[PDB]
Amino acid sequence: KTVVVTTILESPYVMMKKNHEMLEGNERYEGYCVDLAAEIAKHCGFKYKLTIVGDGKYGARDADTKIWNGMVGELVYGKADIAIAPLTITLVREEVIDFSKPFMSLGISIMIKKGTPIESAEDLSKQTEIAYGTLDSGSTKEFFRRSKIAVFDKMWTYMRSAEPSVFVRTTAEGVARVRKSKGKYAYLLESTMNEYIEQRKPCDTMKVGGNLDSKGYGIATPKGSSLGNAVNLAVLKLNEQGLLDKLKNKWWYDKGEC
Amino acid sequence: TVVVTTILESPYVMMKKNHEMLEGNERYEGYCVDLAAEIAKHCGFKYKLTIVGDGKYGARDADTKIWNGMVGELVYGKADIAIAPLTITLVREEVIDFSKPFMSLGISIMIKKGTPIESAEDLSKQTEIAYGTLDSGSTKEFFRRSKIAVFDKMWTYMRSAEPSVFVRTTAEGVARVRKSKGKYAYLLESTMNEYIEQRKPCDTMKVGGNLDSKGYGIATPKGSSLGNAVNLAVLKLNEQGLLDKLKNKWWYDKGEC
Ligand SMILES: CC(C)S(=O)(=O)N[C@H]1COC[C@H]1Oc1ccc(-c2ccc(C#N)s2)cc1
Ligand SMILES: N[C@@H](CCC(=O)O)C(=O)O
Ligand SMILES: N[C@@H](CCC(=O)O)C(=O)O
Ligand SMILES: [Zn+2]
Ligand SMILES: [Zn+2]
Ligand SMILES: [Zn+2]
């Protein structure tokens, strides 16, 4: 049968082609995860359908209703067979879905508007003039929520009670907030997305300091799915054959504008 | 009692200065010694650290198809788990299970300071400076299997080089760089390279970018019940910042250069 692939509109992972309206099915999209999905399916020998996650979310469990939203929810509730997206491997998610070995490394990082007097998470935590936040329903927000590290707990105490909200609905909203806030907003996001934006016009943002953590994106499947084993072996093969390195260069650096 | 196979490789597992008056697990120290203690505490098991008998990581003999090293100890039922700088590879994942990686690394170049080499391309385009890798390891297999022009050229040279450019242990490779007056460069994992760069006599250096990007995983026999719990422990330890704390403790807080 045709494998239902859940994914998310996040640059440069998955984007609508400029002429998408004249195209059909998988042909409407382009990006790192579109190329990776095609390679995994070809190596595993399956037909697939890319579907954009209905709620536009990565995946979090609602504290009250206990329902998973986002791509994680699409896998948990049987709406999709596999997630091929910049989906972070986390302990809470691994308890409900399976992940392949990581296909890409990343860490939480700081995005500033160029010229902002901030060099680290410690600098953000020790001041009040520059506001800062994260994506409202992903792994970055959960990292701060759960952190027992002094600087990060201090950052979370501030973010959770900041008014108006420092949290954003999408990466693009966070980026637009940095760009329009004249250096008064810094955005906390994954190093991969931060490095991509730093290489795009208007070239007015920058990644500053080291990463706050070290983790990876994994291809996700429903718990105990038969696809899990084959997909993990495909990620290992593609890494060893240099495909993953070739795709990162194609989507980040080969088409850099700065 | 869980039998843990591991390897004497700095700063992962090392005999303590006073090992002779110490017994069992207490004889050893290092990143993987601290990691084994953390995993066992979180998973609730007793364990015995045992050093791999042949001193190898693990490769399959082309003729007999027999696995050696820590991989072989798991395959043949001699050990329950491997907690070591054991590279996750496709050929190994076909015979043993690996947790998600607990540490990242790439193949890198070690030179004696002042050696006129900046990259793998520089090594491949000359003959004055010899270069090699560790035997029965994933670095050697990377060059053996590579279809990338520079790396295939490097392998063609290394496989036929006389005298041999390959070494039995990392320490032998490091000692060869140090004694060869800049005429030998060693190809090894960035983790081991960065550790040696921070140790006396401070005469080596990591040069250029990494040739690949991969990780070390905790390994168990295929279908072992321990695999699931150990993978969850690695994810928890990463999230708590314990993996970062151990890397800092063993590499940079213990810096001599
Ligand atoms: C054999 C490979 C498929 S792999 O599983 O090693 N993944 C590689 C594919 O691209 C790059 C690398 O991704 C990684 C992504 C994340 C990590 C980390 C784990 C724990 C950390 C800490 N603290 S950082 C390692 C490797
Ligand atoms: N990759 C993240 C989304 C982005 C973020 O949280 O910064 C996730 O899987 O939740
Ligand atoms: N970590 C490697 C050994 C070192 C090397 O090959 O450079 C392995 O697991 O085989
Ligand atoms: Zn392919
Ligand atoms: Zn602990
Ligand atoms: Zn033989």
Swiss-Prot record, chain A:
Induction: Down-regulated in the pyramidal cell layer of CA1 in the hippocampus by global ischemia. GO terms for cellular component: AMPA glutamate receptor complex; asymmetric synapse; axon; cell surface; dendrite; dendrite cytoplasm; dendrite membrane; dendritic shaft. Disulfide bonds join C203-C258. The record marks R61, R145, K237 as: Interaction with the cone snail toxin Con-ikot-ikot. It comes from the Eukaryota. Detected in forebrain. Detected in dendrites of neuronal cells. Expressed in the pyramidal cell layers of CA1 and CA3 and in the granule cell layer of the dentate gyrus. One of its GO terms (molecular function) is glutamate-gated calcium ion channel activity. Residues 117-258 are extracellular. Changing N239D: Increases rate of desensitization. The keyword Signal applies. Ionotropic glutamate receptor that functions as a ligand-gated cation channel, gated by L-glutamate and glutamatergic agonists such as alpha-amino-3-hydroxy-5-methyl-4-isoxazolepropionic acid (AMPA), quisqualic acid, and kainic acid. L-glutamate acts as an excitatory neurotransmitter at many synapses in the central nervous system and plays an important role in fast excitatory synaptic transmission. Belongs to the glutamate-gated ion channel (TC 1.A.10.1) family. GRIA2 subfamily. This is Glutamate receptor 2. It comes from Rattus norvegicus (Rat). The gene is Gria2. The chain holds residues 414 to 794 of 883 of the full protein.
